[PDB]
Amino acid sequence: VNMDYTLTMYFQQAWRDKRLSYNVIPLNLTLDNRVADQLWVPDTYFLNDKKSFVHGVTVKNRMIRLHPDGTVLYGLRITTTAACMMDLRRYPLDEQNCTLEIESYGYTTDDIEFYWRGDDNAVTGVTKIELPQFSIVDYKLITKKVVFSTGSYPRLSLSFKLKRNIGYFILQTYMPSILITILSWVSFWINYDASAARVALGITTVLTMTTINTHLRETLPKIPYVKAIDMYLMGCFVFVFMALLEYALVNYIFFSQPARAAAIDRWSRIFFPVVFSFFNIVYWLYYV
Amino acid sequence: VNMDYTLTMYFQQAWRDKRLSYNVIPLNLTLDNRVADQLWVPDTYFLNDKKSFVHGVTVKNRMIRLHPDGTVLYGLRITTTAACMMDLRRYPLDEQNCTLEIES
Amino acid sequence: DNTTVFTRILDRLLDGYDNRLRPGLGERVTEVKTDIFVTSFGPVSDHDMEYTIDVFFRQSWKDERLKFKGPMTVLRLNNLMASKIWTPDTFFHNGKKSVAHNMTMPNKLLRITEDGTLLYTMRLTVRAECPMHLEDFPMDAHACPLKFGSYAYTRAEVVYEWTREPARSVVVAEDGSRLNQYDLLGQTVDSGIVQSSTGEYVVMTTHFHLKRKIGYFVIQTYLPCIMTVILSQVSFWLNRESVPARTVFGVTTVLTMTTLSISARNSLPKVAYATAMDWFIAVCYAFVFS
Amino acid sequence: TIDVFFRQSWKDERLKFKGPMTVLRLNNLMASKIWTPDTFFHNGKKSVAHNMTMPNKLLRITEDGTLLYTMRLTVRAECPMHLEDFPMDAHACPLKFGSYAYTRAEVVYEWTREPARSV
Amino acid sequence: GDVTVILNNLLEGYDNKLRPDIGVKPTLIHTDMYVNSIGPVNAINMEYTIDIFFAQTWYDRRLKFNSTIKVLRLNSNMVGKIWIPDTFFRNSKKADAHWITTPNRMLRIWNDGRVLYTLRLTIDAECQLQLHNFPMDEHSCPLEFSSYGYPREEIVYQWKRSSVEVGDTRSWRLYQFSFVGLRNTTEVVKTTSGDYVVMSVYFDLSRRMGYFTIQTY
Amino acid sequence: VQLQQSGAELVKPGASVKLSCTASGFNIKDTYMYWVKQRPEQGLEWIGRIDPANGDTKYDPKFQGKATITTDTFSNTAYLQLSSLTSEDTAVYYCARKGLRWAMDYWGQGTSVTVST
Amino acid sequence: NIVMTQSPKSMSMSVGERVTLSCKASEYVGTYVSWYQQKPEQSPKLLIYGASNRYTGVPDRFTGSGSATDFTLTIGSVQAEDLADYHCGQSYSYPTFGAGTKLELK
Ligand SMILES: *[C@@H]1O[C@H](CO)[C@@H](O[C@@H]2O[C@H](CO)[C@@H](O[C@@H]3O[C@H](CO[C@H]4O[C@H](CO[C@H]5O[C@H](CO)[C@@H](O)[C@H](O)[C@@H]5O[C@H]5O[C@H](CO)[C@@H](O)[C@H](O)[C@@H]5O)[C@@H](O)[C@H](O[C@H]5O[C@H](CO)[C@@H](O)[C@H](O)[C@@H]5O)[C@@H]4O)[C@@H](O)[C@H](O[C@H]4O[C@H](CO)[C@@H](O)[C@H](O)[C@@H]4O[C@H]4O[C@H](CO)[C@@H](O)[C@H](O)[C@@H]4O[C@H]4O[C@H](CO)[C@@H](O)[C@H](O)[C@@H]4O)[C@@H]3O)[C@H](O)[C@H]2NC(C)=O)[C@H](O)[C@H]1NC(C)=O
Ligand SMILES: *[C@@H]1O[C@H](CO)[C@@H](O[C@@H]2O[C@H](CO)[C@@H](O[C@@H]3O[C@H](CO)[C@@H](O)[C@H](O)[C@@H]3O)[C@H](O)[C@H]2NC(C)=O)[C@H](O)[C@H]1NC(C)=O
Ligand SMILES: *[C@@H]1O[C@H](CO)[C@@H](O[C@@H]2O[C@H](CO)[C@@H](O[C@@H]3O[C@H](CO)[C@@H](O)[C@H](O)[C@@H]3O)[C@H](O)[C@H]2NC(C)=O)[C@H](O)[C@H]1NC(C)=O
Ligand SMILES: *[C@@H]1O[C@H](CO)[C@@H](O[C@@H]2O[C@H](CO)[C@@H](O)[C@H](O)[C@H]2NC(C)=O)[C@H](O)[C@H]1NC(C)=O
Ligand SMILES: *[C@@H]1O[C@H](CO)[C@@H](O)[C@H](O)[C@H]1NC(C)=O
Ligand SMILES: *[C@@H]1O[C@H](CO)[C@@H](O)[C@H](O)[C@H]1NC(C)=O
Ligand SMILES: CC(C)c1cccc(C(C)C)c1O
Numbered sequence A: 001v002n003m004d005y006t007l008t009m010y011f012q013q014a015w016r017d018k019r020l021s022y023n024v025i026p027l028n029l030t031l032d033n034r035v036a037d038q039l040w041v042p043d044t045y046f047l048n049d050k051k052s053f054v055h056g057v058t059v060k061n062r063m064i065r066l067h068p069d070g071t072v073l074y075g076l077r078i079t080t081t082a083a084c085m086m087d088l089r090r091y092p093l094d095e096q097n098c099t100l101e102i103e104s105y106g107y108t109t110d111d112i113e114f115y116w117r118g119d120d121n122a123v124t125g126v127t128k129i130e131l132p133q134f135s136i137v138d139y140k141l142i143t144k145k146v147v148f149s150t151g152s153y154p155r156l157s158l159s160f161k162l163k164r165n166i167g168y169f170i171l172q173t174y175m176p177s178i179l180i181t182i183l184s185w186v187s188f189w190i191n192y193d194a195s196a197a198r199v200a201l202g203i204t205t206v207l208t209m210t211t212i213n214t215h216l217r218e219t220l221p222k223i224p225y226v227k228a229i230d231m232y233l234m235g236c237f238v239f240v241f242m243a244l245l246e247y248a249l250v251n252y253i254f255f256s257q258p259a260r261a262a263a264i265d266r267w268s269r270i271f272f273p274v275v276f277s278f279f280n281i282v283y284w285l286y287y288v
Numbered sequence B: 001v002n003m004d005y006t007l008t009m010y011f012q013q014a015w016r017d018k019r020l021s022y023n024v025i026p027l028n029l030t031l032d033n034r035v036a037d038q039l040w041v042p043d044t045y046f047l048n049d050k051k052s053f054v055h056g057v058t059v060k061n062r063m064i065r066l067h068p069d070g071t072v073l074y075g076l077r078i079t080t081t082a083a084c085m086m087d088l089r090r091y092p093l094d095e096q097n098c099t100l101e102i103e104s
Numbered sequence C: 001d002n003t004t005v006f007t008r009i010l011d012r013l014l015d016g017y018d019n020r021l022r023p024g025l026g027e028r029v030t031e032v033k034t035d036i037f038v039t040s041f042g043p044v045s046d047h048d049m050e051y052t053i054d055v056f057f058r059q060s061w062k063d064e065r066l067k068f069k070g071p072m073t074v075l076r077l078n079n080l081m082a083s084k085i086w087t088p089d090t091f092f093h094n095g096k097k098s099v100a101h102n103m104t105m106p107n108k109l110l111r112i113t114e115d116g117t118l119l120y121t122m123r124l125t126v127r128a129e130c131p132m133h134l135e136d137f138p139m140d141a142h143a144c145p146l147k148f149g150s151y152a153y154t155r156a157e158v159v160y161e162w163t164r165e166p167a168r169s170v171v172v173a174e175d176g177s178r179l180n181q182y183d184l185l186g187q188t189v190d191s192g193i194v195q196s197s198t199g200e201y202v203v204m205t206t207h208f209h210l211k212r213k214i215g216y217f218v219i220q221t222y223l224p225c226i227m228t229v230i231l232s233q234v235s236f237w238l239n240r241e242s243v244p245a246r247t248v249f250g251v252t253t254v255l256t257m258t259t260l261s262i263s264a265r266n267s268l269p270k271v272a273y274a275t276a277m278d279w280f281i282a283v284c285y286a287f288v289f290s
Numbered sequence D: 001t002i003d004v005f006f007r008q009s010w011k012d013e014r015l016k017f018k019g020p021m022t023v024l025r026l027n028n029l030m031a032s033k034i035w036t037p038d039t040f041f042h043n044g045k046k047s048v049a050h051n052m053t054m055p056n057k058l059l060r061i062t063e064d065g066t067l068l069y070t071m072r073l074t075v076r077a078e079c080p081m082h083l084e085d086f087p088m089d090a091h092a093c094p095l096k097f098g099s100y101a102y103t104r105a106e107v108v109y110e111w112t113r114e115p116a117r118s119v
Numbered sequence E: 001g002d003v004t005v006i007l008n009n010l011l012e013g014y015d016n017k018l019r020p021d022i023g024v025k026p027t028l029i030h031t032d033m034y035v036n037s038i039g040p041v042n043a044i045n046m047e048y049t050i051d052i053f054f055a056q057t058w059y060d061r062r063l064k065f066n067s068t069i070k071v072l073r074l075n076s077n078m079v080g081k082i083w084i085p086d087t088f089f090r091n092s093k094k095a096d097a098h099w100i101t102t103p104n105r106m107l108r109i110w111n112d113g114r115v116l117y118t119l120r121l122t123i124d125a126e127c128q129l130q131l132h133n134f135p136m137d138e139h140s141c142p143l144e145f146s147s148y149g150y151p152r153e154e155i156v157y158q159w160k161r162s163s164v165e166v167g168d169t170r171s172w173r174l175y176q177f178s179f180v181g182l183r184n185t186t187e188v189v190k191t192t193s194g195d196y197v198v199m200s201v202y203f204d205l206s207r208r209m210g211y212f213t214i215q216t217y
Numbered sequence F: 001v002q003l004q005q006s007g008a009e010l011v012k013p014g015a016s017v018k019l020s021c022t023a024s025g026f027n028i029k030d031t032y033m034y035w036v037k038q039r040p041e042q043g044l045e046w047i048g049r050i051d052p053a054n055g056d057t058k059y060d061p062k063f064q065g066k067a068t069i070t071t072d073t074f075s076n077t078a079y080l081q082l083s084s085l086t087s088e089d090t091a092v093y094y095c096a097r098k099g100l101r102w103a104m105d106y107w108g109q110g111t112s113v114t115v116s117t
Numbered sequence G: 001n002i003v004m005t006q007s008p009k010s011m012s013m014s015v016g017e018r019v020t021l022s023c024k025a026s027e028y029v030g031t032y033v034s035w036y037q038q039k040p041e042q043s044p045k046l047l048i049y050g051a052s053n054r055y056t057g058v059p060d061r062f063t064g065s066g067s068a069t070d071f072t073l074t075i076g077s078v079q080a081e082d083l084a085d086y087h088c089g090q091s092y093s094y095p096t097f098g099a100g101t102k103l104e105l106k
Helices: A033-038 A166-189 A196-213 A213-217 A228-252 A258-287 B033-038 C002-013 C079-083 C215-237 C243-264 C278-287 E004-008 E076-081 E213-217
Strands: A006-014 A029-032 A042-046 A049-053 A063-068 A073-085 A097-105 A134-148 A151-164 B002-018 B029-030 B049-054 B062-068 B071-083 C030-040 C049-064 C072-077 C090-092 C108-113 C117-129 C141-150 C158-161 C168-174 C183-195 C198-210 D003-009 D023-026 D039-041 D057-062 D064-073 D097-101 E029-044 E045-057 E071-074 E088-089 E092-097 E105-110 E113-125 E138-147 E156-168 E175-193 E194-207 F001-003 F017-024 F033-038 F044-052 F055-060 F067-071 F077-084 F092-098 F104-107 F109-112 G004-007 G010-014 G021-024 G031-039 G045-048 G062-066 G071-073 G085-088 G101-104
Touching: A029 F044, A033 A063, A042 A049, A073 A097, A097 A134, A134 B062, A166 A196, A196 A228, A196 C215, A196 C243, A213 A228, A228 A258, A228 C215, B029 F109, B033 B062, C002 C072, C030 E071, C072 C198, C079 C108, C117 C141, C141 C158, C158 C183, C158 C198, C168 C183, C215 C243, C215 C278, D023 E076, E004 E071, E029 E194, E045 E194, E076 E105, E113 E138, E138 E156, E156 E175, E156 E194, F001 F092, F001 F104, F017 F092, F033 F067, F033 F077, F044 F067, F044 F077, F044 F092, F055 F067, F077 F092, G004 G085, G021 G031, G021 G085, G031 G062, G031 G071, G045 G062, G071 G085
Parallel strands: C030 C158, C030 C168, E029 E156, G010 G101
Antiparallel strands: A006 A073, A029 A063, A042 A097, A049 A073, A063 A073, A097 A151, A134 A151, B002 B071, B029 B062, B049 B071, B062 B071, C030 C049, C049 C117, C072 C108, C090 C141, C108 C117, C141 C198, C183 C198, D003 D064, D023 D057, D039 D097, D057 D064, E029 E045, E045 E113, E071 E105, E088 E138, E092 E113, E105 E113, E138 E194, E175 E194, F001 F017, F017 F077, F033 F044, F033 F092, F044 F055, F067 F077, F092 F104, F092 F109, G004 G021, G021 G071, G031 G045, G031 G085, G062 G071, G085 G101
């Protein structure tokens, strides 16, 4: 709906400041985090960030650590909602690619350089992440430069590949639709002289398919293209509408030629499930 | 759904501070609210409150008033969401009891 | 030792400096050149009649009190320097609730050229009003404005101008489309004067031209209504003795039309006039009832 | 969600005093001038340190240099739930805390009473 | 230049904790409002949104200065250095000032000590609606303000002739309602801490019977 | 405040000419400098513009490759050099600066070059 | 490129009457249109900058009016020293000018 994702991380930046060098004390110095206010820190920002904060309980969750040669380690605990524009044409059988863009706001490549410390092991905890609807397939670290009217700036990119889990959607939208289509087929076994019963079956199934999407459409935003799930629902509607049209056809030739009526009834009995099986095979082969 | 209620109130506390006593001027001195940051005020809180704030438009909605005998009057305009767990067995024909606890 | 040299340059700059006064206060109108780089053009909320936009808002002006001569020609300073000097008090006239980003640090840059020129850019998320006339919904198009200018300074003190050619001054990144049911056709700019009880003020305007995309409402509304009408018409090919069957047909299609109208009236805000979609649903209901 | 009085106590021999009182009961304002631990919750999401009408904190210094530091907090914390037995399921929701910057060689935590009686 | 020495002289020995004429006579404050927009009317929470420019004028003879300059025109930078009246809105559920890109505030000081202070505000104000006759229901929604800590003996507010000004009214966010008109009033309310001058603006809003027609009738 | 252009020119075809424009009363870095041309008894036609603070230049697609604009920020001058001028390049060449609302408020005096024998 | 069409090509106004000169643009030019006056043997002088702004020191009889694509220069009292061509130019994009409008006197 919001085309974004929230992530919590420990974000550590290390650099060297010869001004902060000391040769009397031989041990590393973990300082009270407030001293960060009195030190220079790089003006790192996230371009696709919409809302962020450093955690403040019980104090501001930040670490400042000096070493004798002057290297500063500076850590923040950041929760950020970053924007991730998703392509939902294959939803819910889709894979997304969500990025975090780490940039320097004021300092160009003449003032500051960015690199991943470890350069592949710089990001930990990706395999220990349990998303209820997604599975992380891959993550990538990128080091590049961007150019704006004000100069060229260093940038790091952290991207995740997200494959959606379809079990919830099997239980939410697909199985009700399959069951309603089979319920629609049930009418082919009622005798064609019974008009109220077959009309009730057909009308109920057609209208239930036409209205079942309201339950599911709320989660999605207002996109102008057909998703995979909409494709499945429209196929089920076509099948149910064709079952009702078969009933109308049999009822139109019933008082004049009941032989062809029973022939069409048996043909429908055998062939509606066959072509629905073919439709499902084609659908799940095109998308899975 | 949340088992709480929102309450907006003028909350005033009055005490006596001998250090802030005067006789030169016979007036009650209403001062700019900033001076509250330089006086001792009691550490009053509400135990059953979930989210609160003092209003701040156009300035912070609070009052400090001095009295020649030393009486400090200290008011705050506070909106607080306070928890109220409800027994809903007789709902919708029910009576609820909702409290605000004021502690030091 | 550049540390002490540059610290002395900065302390010389800020010594005797009064940030309460604009540059050229007694003898010159402060010229502020501005440009906007939109990094993303966020979603449009027709319910709130507002839109989001993410911008590098760039301003530039001359301040002779900050002339320096040293081993470099431009100081790329921290954001904390900006609070010590005078900056323009630009605000968005039609802006509702905008955010200046502070993560990890204030998203601001200040640059001072040796001749006293100042470049001051900030990263903002501007939420702005866009009054939409939804009479042709969902085939409507809008021009969402963004108006900014000074709050305290009339035109005799501070004027605003586009830093480049007006047609090249508001630039939208090619990747920055967070729109879902709209297309950004383009932008236009303009400059003018408003009048209030406190004087005459320069106002700078941008219009972003949006065209609503119809796919969601075809998939969700128009196709169900058309198929309900077709189902209503199927009833004419049934035997005249099937009175319960055709009664079911008629009443279920009429109720389905009512359901679809009720559910389609929620995609819109609660406007007080009828839209193209409303007229289409009304005509479909007329067909089913007929 | 959980609402807690979170109490910490440590020894700072720099703060020993001798006077007519054995304990100084100071407001939240004094705790800002001294060193306090940087305790955070590991599975916390977005917590609140209540400050109405004043910061709901309390500092107390005993003459031997022992500090008691109490705060009122509202913590939202992650509880990963396995819902296979829903709605007949049971969970153990965790609340993990510790120091943000000081490693085991610098700051250790302990329960003030017997562990079974400390929460 | 010379404005710097004027500003330095005005703020020397200046106590912003004391209102002008603190033990002599009440401070008289003239108020103006410009309504940029009367926002949505939420009928389930009994409130309406409104955006305004709020202007206050008074006299502070500590700020009097003799110069060739007739009026000093300043931004927010000095608002916190002089005495400012503690005006607040009595029926606001929540309200906020504007801070993008800087505090949307303006100060002006004339040589006779006259001070004009303006700021942009967005207010959610409670409006108790009597929803009998809905959807043909008309209401008067109030906006009430007064000083928080200075009673009538210390601060008095007064509307100018040209006090409350609305704009085009077509770009507003009133979908279900139409703006009829407005009036102003001034009263004295007695509270637990004294008697206070209370200013009110009443906005008349009549519900539009075009949405509920299509939706229900 | 003042713009002063070079004297009239008499340039045989095929050669390359260079006209100058000296500014007095302002620094050219604080504005854009435009070069316009005007054929006798016709309208104005914009040749190019330069931003002296950065050296960035723009030209009409008509005069790209024919003309080249540069600046001297010390002498406070702008230069328009017409390298490959044909015989049809006989006009008065004006030097202007960007003004209040992107208007050309101050103009030069006009260097009328001649291309003949 | 934005073409500025100025009209008419020639006007002959007797001393004292009102005159209106028109300029149109093919594309949008918001208010960045300028009106210049050119007497013979002289360089253009900025009369109107933007739409409807009298440039400092020009006679108060000249007025400008404009739109997104339609602009007019009006001389309310055509005096004798207006023996000058008049030019219209847009500055919304890279500047382009009109063809000119020679004002005569019968
Ligand atoms: C419980 O805890 C809560 C959390 O801590 C606490 O809330 C906090 O309260 C404090 C104090 O009440 C708030 O601090 C004040 O904030 C005022 C502005 O508030 C709005 O803006 C802040 C964000 O502020 C940034 O933006 C403004 C304007 O752009 C800047 O002026 C700020 O400095 C600050 O800029 C930094 O951050 C930016 C990113 O945001 C960066 O880009 C930038 O570069 C800077 O780094 C919002 O957070 C506020 O939202 C909250 O409050 C509203 C209230 O309605 C709520 O509705 C909302 O939900 C939020 O809760 C709000 O929107 C400041 O104006 C104010 O500072 C002035 O006053 C103090 C006191 O005198 C001075 O010390 C200070 O120096 C300032 O005075 C100078 O500036 C004014 C102009 O504003 C001048 O007129 C004045 O003369 C003076 O100038 C002099 O000094 C200048 C130096 O500053 C100098 O430059 C001049 O030249 C001159 O010499 C104060 O900081 C804090 O924001 C609250 N935070 C939150 C999260 O609520 C709550 O109160 C506690 N409760 C209790 C009961 O205790
Ligand atoms: C945006 O981020 C910046 C930097 O992360 C924040 O600036 C910091 O603000 C705090 C609190 O206002 C400053 O601490 C203060 O220090 C003074 C002494 O200088 C002390 O008197 C106060 O009690 C308080 O502790 C801190 O120095 C300052 N740091 C820097 C580098 O400017 C800013 O507050 C953030 N804005 C928001 C709205 O969060
Ligand atoms: C998710 O999306 C991002 C964004 O497209 C993907 O990152 C892209 O990764 C490729 C290969 O890793 C990069 O291409 C490489 O560029 C370097 C530049 O030096 C070149 O040397 C290589 O030969 C290769 O072409 C590409 O630049 C990068 N995209 C951006 C915008 O930087 C990412 O692979 C996607 N998937 C995952 C799992 O992250
Ligand atoms: C706003 O309030 C002012 C002051 O109360 C009103 O001003 C009066 O205007 C009428 C004109 O209708 C004059 O006859 C009175 O003499 C004015 N009173 C004063 C004290 O000057 C004004 O009418 C109000 N505006 C409204 C109600 O819309
Ligand atoms: C400081 O830290 C570094 C890296 O963590 C380590 O190699 C070094 O031994 C430490 N110094 C001391 C004195 O422990
Ligand atoms: C001062 O305040 C007290 C509060 O009870 C009141 O009784 C008294 O009259 C006030 N004095 C003056 C001079 O208003
Ligand atoms: C809502 C959408 C996915 C949908 C589902 C089923 C049938 C239809 C039409 C073709 C009646 C339809 O538009």
